[model samples]
Target chain A: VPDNPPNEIYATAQQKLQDGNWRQAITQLEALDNRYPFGPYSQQVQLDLIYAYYKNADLPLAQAAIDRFIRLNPTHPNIDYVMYMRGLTNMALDDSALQGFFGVDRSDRDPQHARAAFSDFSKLVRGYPNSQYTTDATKRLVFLKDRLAKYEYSVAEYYTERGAWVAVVNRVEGMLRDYPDTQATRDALPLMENAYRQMQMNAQAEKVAKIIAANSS
Target chain B: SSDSRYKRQVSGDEAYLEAAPLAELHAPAGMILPVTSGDYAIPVTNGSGAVGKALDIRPPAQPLA
Candidate 1:
């Protein structure tokens, strides 16, 4: 009477997912979304559909699914997941500059774009501080923050490439205060130390040298 | 050469921005490459006594032409 019922849909969708037929699962879920858009189990289909896209590594598709979910019910109980998924896709689609060091394609490293995604993610953390996604959101926020700090310090290296010692010192100081534990900071510290020496900032250079010395130990 | 691939591991100082197969590279601003890419990056977080000494690194991936 209920057009095959939610259980039947859930079972079929779950089986498709378990078998790794994510495309099929998404199709079925979408069909259900169209039919019983406001049913008790409708939200389940939306969640599953989004995850199905994610599992298939279709990041754009997954993002679209989240967008749909967001539009449908902005204040849903698990809406944090919707917001989180969008941020994840955005971050996932970012430019990566730190690639060659790890056999990665060193092509995309747009810090400005990464910051845009960071902004979206930060919004989620603020609004959903108590959501189930809170813990994971916080973890991702920290990781993003650290990565950004490293990138900033890496930017300082560009300045060093051009004898911009004063600028490099400023950038490295910002990095040390921020992403102290990040690799970018580590790499930038030595350069900044050199930059400071070149700039005749003896006190500052000595302080940074000691910092790097302590790091090496 | 991919032998280095499996042998390679990320250091605690460094990290993988991604580990999935569907990753890509974003082109720099105002520059369009002939190739299509997604998002994949691994930040070099550390290069220390042990890190510099060990870990495998062969020639990097060639440009996607």
Candidate 2:
């Protein structure tokens, strides 16, 4: 209602963003988008709007905003950044399971979203290797890899403790093949070795020990 | 010997079904009445010869009498 120009409004929103007024910045940016739908700053407004939504803890809106931005500007030069925001949105979706009640690590619970985030980050890294966001996306991918590997190891450990030796062997071998060189894989070796020995599969037990030795070496 | 129901299902002997009425789709016969309406909407191919014969569907009523 101040009758300011679009540029002036955008500048004002940027000031609000800098002042940590995410909610107000969102209003201004949304207004700017509406008033100047095809203006020069339209795309940047959309992008900043997503960050504003995210900062305001409205992650669903953040996801929706980024999705709309990507859909509208698929070939945008900054598409990699949008994709990275998509990954961050998904990570926030599963933040509850990231640390569940009583501070328990619920890494195994609802890994679908983590997998989604992992996929998004991986897409950014693979498609935009030279992108400014590639380094951070790569780091996020490693973190997700650790979480996923730990989830698998936890499942295999549960099976081992429950005396499901065949299930343990299957789970362990699957983890080793899929998530190599992780702490989870390292921990799986002893559980798998014990399961093999208990199942009277002495040959397999020795094989796993050798594999673990080879990996560590 | 396997149950007649098993034979019907396994052998795919639904030829009798084409000749049978639509209501009998869930009611095989002589075994159990009201054997849970599968609510299967099968075409009624009767004397109408696939022309205009209609299927009259009702919830399974009364045990196999």
Candidate 3:
């Protein structure tokens, strides 16, 4: 009937986590965190809590835990891992499991979380080039960049269809500048050229045509 | 025409060319210039291109390895 020790609580939580009982592990981890806010196991407990929340599909709390951990332990050795987890959590937050299962295109969704994840992974790679998570973070960064560029391309097409030539050109130009290596940017060239042609900007249209030919060849 | 007024006159399109140095606005002493929001505003592109049917909505790019 005595109060459980911090180590004992952590062991129980770890066991639950290893057993794939994320919800139960979260409860035990939260209890441990509250009971020993600054105990020897506090940092590990918070990290485990973040993992538990993420596994349990509680993305918002997972993000909060990550933010708090980063703010409190800016110099922690495992900061890179935490930052990587932040990107993963945001990616999950943006994903719709049902929509993804049905083969819905991810690029059409609101890109807020994907954009946040891009920044998270970007900072992770830049700050911790030697960290173990850098490789995977880099992969996720490419995925996010492609998705964001595609999103911009789609918007440009929408504007083009609406006959908003200026908007179309501006959107495509920004996309090309921001994601020059993305296929979406390359595919958007004709759209931009068409917009310029429609506006009677012959010089710009010719310049875009030359770019398109150069890029194609 | 030896007159000063005819000295700077040029024929054809050249006549419209600016001959005098552009005047700079001088703020009255101690008077603050009003900040204009329109200076940075993007012009709205409002017409339809009518090319909706010709649009090729390329498939989204897949993530690279």
Query: Higher-TM-score candidate among 2 and 3?
Result: 3
Residue range A24-140, candidate 2, lDDT tens digits: 877788778777878546766776677677667577788877887787778866676677778867876765432453346467777787888888877777776664445445555
Which sequence of candidate numbers ranks them by DockQ, best first?
1, 3, 2
lDDT of 1 by residue, A75-165 (tens): 7656566676677666655642345545464423775646656666667767655544454445555566666755665566678888888
Best of the two (1, 3) by TM-score: 3
Which candidate should be chosen as best, given lDDT against the real structure?
3
Q: Could you tell me every candidate's TM-score relative to the true structure?
A: 0.58, 0.68, 0.73
Candidate 3 residue A214 Cα shift, in angstroms, is 0.9
Two-chain DockQ for each candidate model:
0.02, 0.01, 0.01
Error at A52, model 2, angstroms: 1.0
Ranking by lDDT: 3, 2, 1
Model 3 spans > 4 angstroms off: B1-65
Against the true chain A, what TM-score does chain A of candidate 3 give? 0.93
Best by DockQ: 1
Candidate 2 residue pairs in clash (backbone atoms < 3 Å) = none
**Collision count for each candidate, in order:** 7, 0, 4
Candidates 1 and 3: which is better by lDDT? 3
